[model samples]
Target: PQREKWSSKIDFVLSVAGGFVGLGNVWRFPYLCYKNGGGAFLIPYFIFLFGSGLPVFFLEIIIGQYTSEGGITCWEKICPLFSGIGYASVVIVSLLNVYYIVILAWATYYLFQSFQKELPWAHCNHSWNTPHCMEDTMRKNKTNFTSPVIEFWERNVLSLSPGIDHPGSLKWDLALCLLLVWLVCFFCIWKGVRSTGKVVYFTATFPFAMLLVLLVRGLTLPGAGAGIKFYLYPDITRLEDPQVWIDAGTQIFFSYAICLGAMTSLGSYNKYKYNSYRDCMLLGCLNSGTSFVSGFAIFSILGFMAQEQGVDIADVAESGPGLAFIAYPKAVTMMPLPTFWSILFFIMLLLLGLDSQFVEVEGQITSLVDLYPSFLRKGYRREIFIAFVCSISYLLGLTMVTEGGMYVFQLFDYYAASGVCLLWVAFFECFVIAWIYGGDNLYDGIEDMIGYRPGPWMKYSWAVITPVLCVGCFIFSLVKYVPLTYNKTYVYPNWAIGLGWSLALSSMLCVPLVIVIRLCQTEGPFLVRVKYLLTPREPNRWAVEREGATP
Candidate 1:
């Protein structure tokens, strides 16, 4: 069966870049820079980017392009035993795709509300607003406060349960909004890469434009310089901390969607002669640079919020969903024409989130179709296949819409989407490629496609630097593991945290279990079987096929 290919080099670049430049780039990185030594963090961040991220990233791309297979089949093509790394990446993507849209649903609901004459979160007099909820007026004048934006998120929007134990009844607004979100996602990828390629042209570029506008507005605001300073001011002393290095490496994994299978699946669609190395560098730089630029936009507004509220920047600045849904919204309320700015911000958030979901759902679909090519032989079967996938995922995702949904979202984010899973997957991926498949052989394979072999630097980086850093980061993450917390108040119950770890380990265990199974399937003595399973598939097959000749 023939595999799908991107329409053009630019389309592939934009789609892949779109995948890398995701929601985390906007919300997560700014705060990381602020907390991790500001400008000093950039040093380790780029160090890891060059020393670890780019090599691992190019390695994944080369694997897919060389094999012309999805994540599942690609690893089997590379080395049969460690094919579980592919399975693990797909599983993580599946889990991420389920809860990820819950984020888009929240954004959609906020997008609809943003059109109102006065933003709901701008005032605290509503019934859902607690006695503790405070508007800018209260915050600027009083000591004790809860933000109206926080109340809007927790009380009005979420109608949150007291804890995970409650699992409060579903809110109809979010429920309906969620259905709409799934419908949008379903249509976006119903036709697979052809459709996804066309969609990314718009979804990818629009957000960049919006971010520029937001930055311009942010720069003109009061305390803008202070906010920008908070993001850029380097503390040379903080570089002495090991956690900072770990954070930088982990952030690279998150920013690039490394170990997540999207990159592999996306790269699998490239033309045989495509220059993946050039594209890898372009997208990697764009992703991190976008993240750096996003800091200025996000922190400037946060600086304004901090200034207006008479609070330190830390009080108003947050990371992850909290920053986007709570902190940013609070800052938006204090802006001139809050509705206009809020709509722009949430739409940018929605597009950023949707672009990521596209890559993930498409990745899973690509893996399935590659494994079972017959399913796509008939007319409209591909469309129906994706529809089936999206419908089932939507039903499974309903857990996140319950009143206790935020708790479940946090649990998923903490365990499933956490850095640990990526680091674990990265370690095995590097080991299998660089050690078993042979880094020299892998380098020659890339040369066959792109016309020149990379230097010793990339070869050593793949075999040594990337995997070693991944292992170090993974161990550090375990040592520093903390219970899931939401709103800085509710700590997840022991059972919920246990459930989270189960999710984390479940993905990781895919590797060793598959190794055992593959060994059983292979013949001969144990060492012979192990060596046979570790052997790479022929990389010159695509070259032979393109010339209309094959062994």
Candidate 2:
């Protein structure tokens, strides 16, 4: 039977585009840019993007498009001994799926609160506000007083427990929001690409329109110029630190959504003769372009907020949830017609976040269906299977909606999908493709499909540059690893730290485990089995039988 395909080329482009440009573009990239040396950070950022990101991006897509196989099964076609790479990716994506949707739930909660006459985070008069909570107008004159925005985030939305060990009861409001988020995600991709293809028409394009609106409004704000200045000002000296380079490398990998199974699974749905080379070039430029432009949209408003609060831009800036929920929400409250902006901001966040969440879910679903096509690919079975997967994810996700859920969220965020693990997977991907399968073979495969060979740049990248960078950054990350902390004040218990490491190693161990299993299962001496497993299972099967033909 034939695998499912995207209904149109636009469907494929929009779907992958939506996944690549996610919350990181809006929140994480901007913060990393300014924190890592503003415009100077781009030097290293683009360096890694070309050096590692795009090459691997192309590698995964070619693997999928060439083999016409899911992420898990595709590895066996190329090299069976390294098939565990797919399982490792599945584990990482599974961990990410659980916590990443928690962000969407938080956005949903905020979107609900945005319907109020005045934004709920706008003042200190609410029941959730503490004695230390100070309104924006009064905050400029006060010392040691928390803003109402901070109080609303820490108290009302999260209802945070004293620490990770406390494990207070779940917040039903957040849980309800989480349930709603899961339901929305379920409907979007329940039919695989048919539904997801249609949904991306809205989910993928809406964020750009909102960003343009916000950008125009943000630029008109009183202090937007200063914010933009801070965002782009090059700290040439900050480049002296190795951490800046590491940060750039991690951001490129994370923001581009590489080394994850999502790209491979998405590419597997393409028509065999489709020109993925053009798609990869378009997406690589678009992903980094969005990250750069998103900074202007984000920091312009943040500059206005700093002006309103009479604080430095540094004081107003944050990354991840702090930026999305706390800093941006606070900025929106200060704008005219606060509720309008608040609703727009959170809706934009929801759409952007929803795209990444469902695509990753689709990747995992694709892998499972390929693994068990007899049961899953039947009529109505895919739908039921998707529901089962979503239900399980929701139940596991409920841990993050608890009072101490934020702690658990941070722990998972820190270790489960950490950069080190991603780089480890990435390094082997290049090693296998370049060394085992042969980079020249991959180039010829692409040339067969597209009728043109890629340049020597990609060849050298896959063979040498990307692998070395991955290994170097992987080592640097381990050497500089810091234990998880909350708000820079609360340290996780020793048990939690151990749990975090266990989460990391759980995915990392899959590669070697699969190697051992494959070696043992093969019917020969060790050297013979090694040689047998390294060779492609069907050496001549990847090529299309006729030009312009579908698989």
Candidate 3:
């Protein structure tokens, strides 16, 4: 028996696009655009998009398709000494999958609530509302009050403790919701890429349709222009600060899910002769383009929320979970057919996140199966492998559904998926692939696939520019890191900060750790081992040959 592939080239394109172009652009990019330079951010954004985004994105796909292996195994094929790059990426992605599913659980809970005639977060007078809960209407009129939607998230859904110090008992409803989330993921990928490819066909493209619907509705509302203005209006002065540039480069990595092995995993499923370079460029445009378009959809509604609330758009705007769960849902309460919009919005979020989650899970699962095919790949074993993996992931994720779960979610998001760990992975990956693997070697392989040599711009980018940008961002992140804080308040205690650092280093350290392990295993003196490690692994024959060329 053999491993499976995407059913068609269309499936590969949709599947890869689905993995990178989902919930991240929907929520993360809009806030980043505004925070950095209003419209001025686009300058740095597109600058990095060419300088950093496309080059690194292309490298990962090249590695996967050239090697035809999972994330972990692919690195072993390219540079055995740096094979741990694959392992570390898989580890961080697995940690992400654990906490990430809780988000879908939250979405599920919201989706169920949307069926009611009146939306739960619409008015503030529920049993969950505190004396502080103010309806959006009252709060809109300059009433000194907390938001009703915030109360729903904090009081009702989370029932949050004061901080991580008290994690409190589990929320039973959310725990069950977590179960449902994992079960859904397990089935989506139970048959590996065959099932996954089919799932992404719907999960990937359907969100755009929903986003268009939301965008049209949002535009017709009063004050929508203000939100779009906040998103796209250029503030040239902000670019003088270096952090905006770093943020743009990092978001490029985050938005593409680059260097975390998800792209490599998706790319590995493509047929050997697939035009990975063309596919990379196509998806790159689609990804950043979606981010640009989604800003219109997100802020237009937030603009309307601001108008309805009688507050500045800043008061209504947020990033991450707050934007999706708190702000947008809160805004929906004011729209005609509040339940209708609420359900539609969350369904899009669910689909968006589902696609991202599917690829990451597939990457991790495929890594192990590729490594030990004898045990994991024979007959029903891959199915069993996925089941056990999902079950374990569900058990590990239970803490997030607890009363203090939101705090833990913040911890994982900041540390495991932080700028530092991700950029370091990208930095080393580029260094190994370009300088060590031979940029020309990679280019020749690409030329074989597409029948044209890569431009010098890309060749040098992978060799020099991308790695320098990655290192620069990694250092800046360390200097700028404040103790983990929630909502600009609730600073994490020293112990929690220590725990967060551990999560970061656990994966980052793997880059060097694997090098040392490779050294220890080599049968020679230090200099000899260094020379051996620097030597490139044999490039796959298929990667170097043209169609119909005889061996």
Candidate 4:
């Protein structure tokens, strides 16, 4: 019944590869390294990249390719208990993605600004009439993961406004730029996956090109080697903190978007013979590779910035927005052809964010269509539904563009990234997938579905290692976030805490609640006869029976 098929396995890999590499890799990773503990941080990062991220990514792939159906439904069919988990994952991903687009919009705006090449705020030169200044700013390591001394916060507080906060009230230009950035997100995501899908072609390409540009441009910049040296100078003492390893693993999981239900739902679209296990391996490799290669572009530029700013590479960059908006753009502005280089960099960022969003939409549509197939039935107009849903989302995005928009966006990012909602879901997913259904049976189903059994490595990972690590990471990521305000120095207002809890608890609890509801209400045609559940894929390597009560 499916209308489109990937031209070949390579197309699938490339398409997936395209989506996997994005803002996290190119924008977030480099700065996180500097922010956390350069060179030394890589120790735990690599451990998690292989240990936690890779294994789960492959597991999601097998689940999807084996079922060849969208996420929740596939999990449900495999095990009646898991029926709603997919939906829960989709909801979590879509919300995470909603805030992500705002970041993408920042890239889009920067892409446009690159044309002017003026380097808006890199110096203390208040010479221009425009509000943008060249103030010499000092960036210090705030990563709490640092050895002996750790710094955790990215220095760019939204309150800072990049223009000397409290220097005056709000400036219209900064506010306008924020609004414009949000609108760009509206435009990109408004039609659902179509715009996002189409944009991926460029967004996916331009950043890699920009990487190459920065490689040459950055390497050539004055004192570029200093950046390289700064990046490599490692303080091994940071590993003393268990939290650093935990955070690194979590970042890798988040960076690749693994175990998030995003990849599995998209993978469900593939045909039976597509060799998803292979796809899993291929895509995972590409995702990690991109993250590694991006370091070249990042450090080189940082090296240049460090030299120019007369600061260490650490001072030149910060995590989160610093690497994307503040550090890199400022670094590029110092380039010879500032206009050209800046445009390319921002455009590259747009490509990264846009293509990433493409898959995010695909994850959503794939979920809705796979679950509620009635729409594309005759004149139901599924495409219209896509547009309408996106329009509604667009209207909702308008709220972020209002007063204190950046603050709102930051709040969304913090909660969505490591929210308890998703941690709860992931906790249960492992419990059900491993503890309920025997790992061997799931392994058998995978072999039957993909025609290739995963190696011993994957089996052990699925059975024990990955699940344990996921729970550990989930706990570590959330324990400190308990009071909700990013910094412990300030308490989140009552309303903010309410909103945070509402989103987290609501999403976390939604899946099991729906499953309970379905189990309780026996329907006209079908029902779950057992209060217990496991991988209920007929418990055989053959077709699942639809008639009679399931055993």
Candidate 3 lDDT tens digits, 504-525: 8899898888888999999878
The C-alpha lDDT values of all candidates are 0.78, 0.80, 0.77, 0.59
lDDT of model 3, residue 388: 87
Which candidate leads in lDDT? 2
lDDT-wise, the better of 3 and 4 is: 3
Q: Could you estimate the TM-score for every candidate?
A: 0.91, 0.92, 0.92, 0.79
Q: Which residue runs of candidate 4 sit more than 4 Å off their true CA positions?
A: 117-119, 122-205, 219-237, 240-246, 310-318, 375-380, 417-422, 449-451, 476-498, 522-532, 539-551
RMSD of 3: 2.8
Alpha-carbon RMSD, each predicted model? 2.9, 2.8, 2.8, 6.4
Clashes per model (N, Cα, C within 3 A): 0, 0, 1, 16
Output the better candidate (1/2) by lDDT: 2
Task: Supply the global lDDT for candidate 2.
Answer: 0.80
Error (Å) of candidate 4 at residue 467 is: 1.8
Q: Work out how many backbone clashes candidate 2 has.
A: 0
